[PDB]
Write a protein that binds this ligand. Structure first.
Ligand SMILES: [Ca+2]
Ligand SMILES: [Ca+2]
Ligand SMILES: [Ca+2]
Ligand SMILES: [Ca+2]
Ligand SMILES: [Mn+2]
Ligand SMILES: [Mn+2]
Ligand SMILES: [Mn+2]
Ligand SMILES: [Mn+2]
Ligand SMILES: [Xe]
Ligand SMILES: [Xe]
Ligand SMILES: [Xe]
Ligand SMILES: [Xe]
Ligand SMILES: [Xe]
Ligand SMILES: [Xe]
Ligand SMILES: [Xe]
Ligand SMILES: [Xe]
Ligand SMILES: [Xe]
Ligand SMILES: [Xe]
Ligand SMILES: [Xe]
Ligand SMILES: [Xe]
Ligand SMILES: [Xe]
Ligand SMILES: [Xe]
Ligand SMILES: [Xe]
Ligand SMILES: [Xe]
Ligand SMILES: [Xe]
Ligand SMILES: [Xe]
Ligand SMILES: [Xe]
Ligand SMILES: [Xe]
Lengths: 237, 237, 237, 237
């Protein structure tokens, strides 16, 4: 199977697989069962922003999620990503719906990684920022139901013409270029990611959520990963 | 054939195909016969830096090349790149040797492109910076004789164990991710590139040069483009 | 008097001092009488974005102004800023009202300057980005009627409690740190600025406009520069 | 007295004030007696690089110092800087000599701070990068013996014509613009700093070291802070 590190914005409490009984943000290291969670006061139909940060010195993966005019939610987990992920990875966004549904609309997404070596000319860096997604967005690998270019957004899961989110949908978008997250002369490696999302559901119980993830470069949507598994994991182990 | 836009650092005067009778920097639009050139006081064995800039408002492709402690050389050409290149491109470095030879060593390479739309959330951007190249540099597509990881550099053309550059060599490196250089809601599109290079030759007459180029995404080394054609063009038309 | 280089968003046609008979964007070099203008379809009450770009190789000051969903306006003028401005400058935003009035609200402002030398460690850079202005914004020098922190914006000219713009108002905001726009070993110097603004007026004839400007470091609002002179110039010469 | 947060590169072991018995890197929170240190294999006459990182989510101030071809040294300390520093600060470099001496030469210095709010237009940022310092470097406040423009470097402490470092010297350089390190709607605040330095001494026992620091905006060199106090503190409490 793939190797996954993810920050999940989990809109549906599956308490049977260890979610808390509320929408939450979580850090997922090789399992959908988050290593750490925090309560998230998800706002149906509002545009939210998630920020994810990490560096190889502190070895702490942290995320903050917020909406305008509201208090944020934050979660952190100590993990050495060099011990979890391969040296080259892809980074992406995933979302899913199941029997419950919601739009999983991404309005912007940015990412920066930096590897600073001990050579005085120190830095290798990659940065991208999408504030509009085009119908044929060649620097993204879209998987599953993900589409780009509808109102200039990235729709990770299926939405009908009329704006209605569909159930049992899964979709991901990965940045085209592999990302180097370790180098042998690196003295500091860091990354940050930000994305803005609009999750709306005609229903009181939206599902299932959106994740920012980092994976093996050849990562693909696991069989049966609609719903609670967020398009990230083959099972709930 | 491919579509090429390039800034050439041409170390060998091929006066039969319109080079001036000295090493020069040139702007090449769909032809090796530069649309504009400037004299370049190339310094054998010294590390030089080239800077290339362009934006869609001014529609002027400009480059400056310099060495420490020396006056720079600059060349500019008015060209609307949106009328030359496709909407998606790859960007890269190329170099070649022929019967005359030189190392075509790249010590660093950075690139930024920005498309700013009329939406208040305006910007799509891509930036990369390499200050060290690793043996398996997965975010570069190496073509021809190009190799990475020898002393942490990108050697565009063949060099033997002993540091000796080889003749009749051609090599390119393209960044892995396609680059979007036009979008329909863009009000300004710009790019800049910088690279540092070390061209050294045991010979009085080094050849052939290094170019930064932008091409169709599927660009490949043209048959017979060693030597004066810089790994960019199939012929000298 | 001060030395001013500015891009003006001129909302009021003063045809007696050479404005065209419509709202326009202009490049002003040491005079309010723009060296170059373009028609601007200013939208009362809508948030617009202005982008300004320049580099020392091309020596062309260009600006683009746009609103969402609308075609942009652009203006360019060939000028060597090193021959106009001192080596150190401040950069800022200015606006004014006169007998006609409008809000001159700045919602965001960013600026980047870069000087790249011929030393392989090439770059001196300054960048700032404001997306919210705080009541006591210590890295801005506010002049005249400019205030910060009202709804997190920079109000360049006086607005009453009720949101009503006041006539005969002038205000500027300059970034606190001087900016180096030339250095003796520089081979390329460039800058870009972006700001977002909301100009609204209860009146059919708003006035007078907003400018991004660059000036001597000690620049101050000229006596009698309310109205058509945009807080930039002492007279209309 | 001022409020100081600093990362020290302490070249001289003053074991009487709690330094370890070797050159070390340290995190100093309101005291010269570092809260955390790590051994540093300082290399006399070689150019080293220090990197400092912090964010308000993790509340961990970390630094890494390295030389080319050598293993790095790193130190971290959990501290909420919002509880130590005022909301606006200046950032700078300090160094000193005492009865023992060394050059305290800064060859480059860069700094980025970011405050990201919960408003979807999230970011306030400041970034500067110096790779050459000019004789009259108007965006730096030089204090004590600090000078700029000698070989394009920042010499924090006194050096004679002949390159000889002088004893009993203290000097600092602060960036001109205040820096906002907290805002009330901020959900993440972060900073990073990097500088490159050349510490050389004709003596076996160089002293005293270089620090990157953050202080009240009006920070000044404390009386009697030559030597072990690094130009940062009035005493060794
Ligand atoms: Ca769930
Ligand atoms: Ca040639
Ligand atoms: Ca006017
Ligand atoms: Ca000490
Ligand atoms: Mn969960
Ligand atoms: Mn040529
Ligand atoms: Mn005008
Ligand atoms: Mn110490
Ligand atoms: Xe992640
Ligand atoms: Xe974060
Ligand atoms: Xe990572
Ligand atoms: Xe990453
Ligand atoms: Xe990383
Ligand atoms: Xe190019
Ligand atoms: Xe350039
Ligand atoms: Xe381009
Ligand atoms: Xe490009
Ligand atoms: Xe471009
Ligand atoms: Xe300007
Ligand atoms: Xe522009
Ligand atoms: Xe400028
Ligand atoms: Xe400028
Ligand atoms: Xe500039
Ligand atoms: Xe610090
Ligand atoms: Xe660090
Ligand atoms: Xe800080
Ligand atoms: Xe800071
Ligand atoms: Xe900070």
């Amino acid at each position: 199977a793939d190797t996954i590190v993810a920050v999940e914005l989990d809109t549906y409490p599956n308490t049977d697989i260890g979610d808390p009984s509320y929408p939450h943000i979580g850090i997922d290291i090789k399992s959908v069962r988050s290593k750490k969670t925090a309560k998230w006061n998800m706002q149906n139909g509002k545009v939210g922003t998630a920020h994810i940060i990490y560096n190889s010195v502190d070895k702490r993966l942290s995320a903050v999620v917020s909406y305008p005019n509201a208090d944020s939610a934050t979660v952190s987990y100590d993990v050495d990503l060099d011990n979890v992920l391969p040296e080259w990875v892809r980074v992406g966004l995933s979302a899913s719906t199941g029997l419950y549904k919601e739009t999983n609309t991404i309005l912007s997404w940015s990412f920066t990684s930096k590897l600073k070596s001990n050579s005085t000319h120190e830095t290798n860096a990659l940065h991208f920022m999408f504030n509009q997604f085009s119908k044929d967005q060649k620097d993204l690998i879209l998987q599953g139901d993900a589409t780009t270019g509808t109102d200039g957004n990235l729709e990770l899961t299926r939405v009908s013409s009329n704006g209605s989110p569909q159930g049992s949908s899964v979709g991901r978008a990965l940045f085209y270029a592999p990302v180097h997250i370790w180098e042998s002369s690196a003295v500091v490696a860091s990354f940050e990611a930000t994305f803005t999302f609009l999750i709306k559901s005609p229903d009181s119980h939206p599902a299932d959520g959106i994740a920012f993830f980092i994976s093996n470069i050849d990562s693909s949507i696991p069989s049966g990963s609609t719903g609670r598994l967020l398009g990230l994991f083959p099972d709930a182990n």
